[PDB]
Design an enzyme around this catalytic site. Sequence first.
Site, short mmCIF file in Angstrom:
data_model
loop_
_atom_site.label_atom_id
_atom_site.label_comp_id
_atom_site.label_asym_id
_atom_site.label_seq_id
_atom_site.Cartn_x
_atom_site.Cartn_y
_atom_site.Cartn_z
N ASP A 93 0.84 -1.05 -0.14
CA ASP A 93 -0.07 0.08 0.18
C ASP A 93 0.85 1.28 -0.14
O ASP A 93 1.61 1.53 0.88
CB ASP A 93 -0.95 0.25 1.30
CG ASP A 93 -1.96 0.94 1.25
OD1 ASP A 93 -1.96 1.93 0.53
OD2 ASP A 93 -2.84 0.89 2.19
N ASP A 100 -4.02 6.90 -3.52
CA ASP A 100 -3.81 5.87 -2.24
C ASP A 100 -4.43 4.53 -2.98
O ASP A 100 -5.64 4.43 -3.35
CB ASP A 100 -4.86 6.26 -1.13
CG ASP A 100 -4.75 5.15 0.08
OD1 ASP A 100 -4.02 4.29 0.06
OD2 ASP A 100 -5.58 5.62 1.11
N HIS A 139 -12.00 5.90 2.68
CA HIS A 139 -12.26 7.40 3.26
C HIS A 139 -12.08 8.50 2.31
O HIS A 139 -11.52 8.12 1.29
CB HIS A 139 -10.95 7.47 4.13
CG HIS A 139 -9.63 7.20 3.68
ND1 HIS A 139 -8.89 8.05 3.00
CD2 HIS A 139 -9.00 5.97 3.68
CE1 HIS A 139 -7.72 7.23 2.51
NE2 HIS A 139 -7.85 6.04 2.95
N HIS A 193 -6.61 11.33 5.01
CA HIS A 193 -8.08 10.78 5.71
C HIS A 193 -8.72 12.32 5.90
O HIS A 193 -8.51 13.04 6.78
CB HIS A 193 -7.96 10.23 7.09
CG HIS A 193 -7.65 8.54 6.90
ND1 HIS A 193 -7.74 7.79 8.06
CD2 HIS A 193 -7.22 8.04 5.75
CE1 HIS A 193 -7.45 6.65 7.69
NE2 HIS A 193 -7.00 6.56 6.27
N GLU A 221 -11.36 1.16 -0.32
CA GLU A 221 -10.52 0.09 0.31
C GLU A 221 -11.22 -0.98 0.86
O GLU A 221 -12.13 -0.42 1.84
CB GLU A 221 -9.08 0.46 0.79
CG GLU A 221 -9.44 0.93 2.30
CD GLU A 221 -8.19 1.67 2.79
OE1 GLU A 221 -7.05 1.00 2.55
OE2 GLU A 221 -8.23 2.93 3.07
N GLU A 246 -7.10 -1.52 -3.17
CA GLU A 246 -7.64 -0.26 -2.77
C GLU A 246 -7.33 0.50 -4.29
O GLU A 246 -6.48 0.32 -4.87
CB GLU A 246 -6.92 0.49 -1.72
CG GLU A 246 -7.19 1.75 -1.64
CD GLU A 246 -6.50 2.29 -0.49
OE1 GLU A 246 -5.19 1.99 -0.08
OE2 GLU A 246 -6.77 3.22 0.15
O1 LIG Z 1 -10.87 4.35 11.89
C1 LIG Z 1 -9.62 3.94 11.06
C2 LIG Z 1 -8.25 3.99 11.60
C3 LIG Z 1 -7.17 2.98 10.99
C4 LIG Z 1 -7.70 3.12 9.42
C5 LIG Z 1 -6.46 2.80 8.33
C6 LIG Z 1 -6.71 2.95 7.14
N1 LIG Z 1 -5.55 2.77 6.11
C7 LIG Z 1 -5.09 1.54 6.09
C8 LIG Z 1 -4.04 1.63 4.86
C9 LIG Z 1 -4.24 2.99 4.09
O2 LIG Z 1 -5.21 2.57 2.94
C10 LIG Z 1 -3.17 3.67 4.19
O3 LIG Z 1 -2.69 3.77 3.04
N2 LIG Z 1 -2.78 4.44 5.22
C11 LIG Z 1 -1.72 5.32 4.95
C12 LIG Z 1 -1.65 6.34 6.20
C13 LIG Z 1 -0.44 6.41 6.92
C14 LIG Z 1 -0.40 7.11 8.07
F1 LIG Z 1 0.77 7.23 8.71
C15 LIG Z 1 -1.56 7.65 8.81
C16 LIG Z 1 -2.90 7.46 7.83
CL1 LIG Z 1 -4.33 8.18 8.14
C17 LIG Z 1 -2.70 6.63 6.49
C18 LIG Z 1 -5.44 3.48 4.96
O4 LIG Z 1 -5.85 4.78 4.83
C19 LIG Z 1 -8.02 3.29 6.62
C20 LIG Z 1 -8.97 3.61 7.69
C21 LIG Z 1 -8.67 3.65 8.94
N3 LIG Z 1 -9.92 3.67 9.81
MN LIG Z 2 -6.70 4.43 2.13
MN LIG Z 3 -3.79 2.72 1.09
#
Ligand SMILES: O=C1CCc2cc(N3CC[C@](O)(C(=O)NCc4cc(F)cc(Cl)c4)C3=O)ccc2N1
Ligand SMILES: [Mn+2]
Ligand SMILES: [Mn+2]
Length: 365
Positions: free
Chosen positions: A141, A152, A221, A229, A254, A349
Amino acid sequence: VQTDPPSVPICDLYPNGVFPKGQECEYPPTQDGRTAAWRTTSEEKKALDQASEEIWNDFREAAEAHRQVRKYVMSWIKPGMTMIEICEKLEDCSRKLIKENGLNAGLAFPTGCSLNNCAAHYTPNAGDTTVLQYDDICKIDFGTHISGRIIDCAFTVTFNPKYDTLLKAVKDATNTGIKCAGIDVRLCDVGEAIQEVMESYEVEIDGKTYQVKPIRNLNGHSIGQYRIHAGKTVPIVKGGEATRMEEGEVYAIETFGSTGKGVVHDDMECSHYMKNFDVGHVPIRLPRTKHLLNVINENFGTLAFCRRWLDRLGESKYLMALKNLCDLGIVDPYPPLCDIKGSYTAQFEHTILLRPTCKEVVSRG
Ligand SMILES: O=C1CCc2cc(N3CC[C@](O)(C(=O)NCc4cc(F)cc(Cl)c4)C3=O)ccc2N1
Ligand SMILES: [Mn+2]
Ligand SMILES: [Mn+2]
């Protein structure tokens, strides 16, 4: 022409500065049944779409870099490689194709390479000896951006065919989410449709049977400029919020499937961190803490980063400074998210643009 291995920036491959569109879809019909086809030919919808053309062009440049990086990754990712080796080879390619230039173009967030029960937010820190195994299920990812317009996009890598039906379940649930998404659609409806598709799959792994479970506390998201986010949640189980998607918004669609509990909890050593978007200017006198916040502000802004990237910038002995920023609420930690030990998780995703004229799956070629 792009080289093998890829090294030519996407910018140099399109001399006219016009980047390729992703898959374009007509929006789903209403509950009553009236089509959304009218959007494509509407002069008002066209002008509005045209008003945001430079924005869609930036997402498309980031998406073309993402597609070329992931096709390159698929060609060499193999068991025996360290997770550090995989992340560095992927990131080296991504930096070259995006033509990394501070906050104007670059990597939008660290390379997730979460394994097995861990579903997300694992990237190795320095010294991590983890090696990819033949029986592993690895979620790649990663993100690219142009002017903070983030792509993303993620896929799951396996070597053992025993996981093929688990991957197919999650791919089908993600495609269902993409299909269901659209302007005025209830976010809970998307979640219920995803869950229905994912839970229709039963899988057999080493003589044990499972019904594929969506990870209820993970979700899709909304995406904002320099904001991974942006505030809206796209659930992957029923029981969600009846809030609606809107015109001009961008979403990461995703889904995650699990043979475990279908719930994740924080686990292992933290590698991912990100400045809290809602925290304003905070004067810091503590010198190591002050320096680290300045490094973060200059190199990442509100984009997520990892410890390896601080190491690459020549920073050292920054862990207490980083803990201080977390304790002060300026930076938030994002530790690895895991289901139960012995469970298998998979993820797919794509990024979508809810353009006034059509729905563009910008990360899909
Ligand atoms: O409630 C929740 C809490 C956990 C969560 C995790 C996600 N994921 C999981 C993998 C993801 O696709 C990604 O690539 N993340 C990169 C990323 C790195 C960071 F350092 C910080 C942040 Cl915010 C995002 C993503 O968005 C999606 C929804 C939730 N919902
Ligand atoms: Mn994501
Ligand atoms: Mn992602």
